[PDB]
Amino acid sequence: IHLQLPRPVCEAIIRPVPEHRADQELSEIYRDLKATFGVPWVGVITQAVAYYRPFFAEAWRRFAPSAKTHFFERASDDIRIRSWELMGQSFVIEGQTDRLREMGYSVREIGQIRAVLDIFDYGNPKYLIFATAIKEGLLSGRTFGGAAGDARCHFPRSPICQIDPIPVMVEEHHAGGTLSQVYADIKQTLQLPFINSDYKAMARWPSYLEQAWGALKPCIDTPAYQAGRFDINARALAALDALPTAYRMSRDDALQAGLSEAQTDELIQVISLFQWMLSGLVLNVTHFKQQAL
């Protein structure tokens, strides 16, 4: 009837290691991840995988060569583009700029809000593709990519990037009552046990987040949203298949790296949920950005 991306089962407890808690050793991997993706934040996805640290270190080591490439840059960008395309076609997204002005937001402040949205509009596809690699590698045991056709695919990615500062994020333990209820609403509506970095950064401006989320919420899990989400997911799987450097990181690789059988089961649930989440997050950020046009 319409394409619907099924949410996986996750009973595993999720234990993200935030940047402000990461020890020196973890922080160096975090630094490399941000420098390579060219983003100023470590994804909650990668924070959660990092709990299984030796797996995280090895999976990053193996994925990183592909992430440095022209191919990966383009594949990520094309997902941003597809999202923009879908949401523009399927939804009448009224602009919120006048409404924000009426609330008292100045031109500069709205500019700052846009800039925060741009960070995630750029970065999230990269996280989506990485999460997809981690999940599919664990589930299938397959070796992905490394076909090396067009030589330009292996060229270095477009070199510029913003890696500082970490965006201002209102963590759950920072948050007061009213903000906690918006977080609760987002969690329930999106079927997640965590608050994404994106929403926490928007929450630097609580009345903006309330507005932006309130306009998005009715679109969630409409047929068009759901079909679009499925499409974004398919794009991410297609990118995994075309990685310029082969990626393999199976259960046995996880065991080799020092995970137990039980941790590996747990990790599979954790990454599956994050991977599913990420196609939705891409569409959501696109919606926010188009609202603020």
Q: Which residues bind a second copy (CB under 8 A)?
A: 18, 20-21, 24, 38-39, 70, 77, 80-81, 84-85, 103-106, 108-109, 118-119, 121-123, 151-152, 155-156, 158-162, 168, 170-179, 181-182, 204-208, 210
**Could you please report the per-residue DSSP string of 64-101?**
HHHHTBHHHHHHHHHHHHHHHHHHHHH------HHHHH
As measured in angstroms, the least distance from the Cβ of 191 to a second copy is 24
Tokens of 231: 């499409």
As measured in angstroms, the least distance from the Cβ of 84 to a second copy is 6
Taking the least distance from each CB to a second copy, the nearer of 137 and 228 is 228
Taking the least distance from each CB to a second copy, the nearer of 196 and 264 is 196
Q: Which residues on adjacent β-strands are paired with residue 247?
A: 144
Taking the least distance from each CB to a second copy, the nearer of 38 and 280 is 38
As measured in angstroms, the least distance from the Cβ of 19 to a second copy is 9
As measured in angstroms, the least distance from the Cβ of 18 to a second copy is 8
| 139: alpha, beta or left? (left if phi > 0; alpha if psi -120 to 50) | alpha
Place of tokens 């075309």: 242
Q: Which of 47, 16, 59, 26 is nearest to 257 (CA)?
A: 59
Taking the least distance from each CB to a second copy, the nearer of 121 and 266 is 121
Q: What is d(CA 88, CA 13) in angstroms, rounded to the nearest whole number? A: 36
Taking the least distance from each CB to a second copy, the nearer of 83 and 272 is 83
Q: What contacts 262, CB < 8 A, 6 or more positions away?
A: none
As measured in angstroms, the least distance from the Cβ of 184 to a second copy is 13
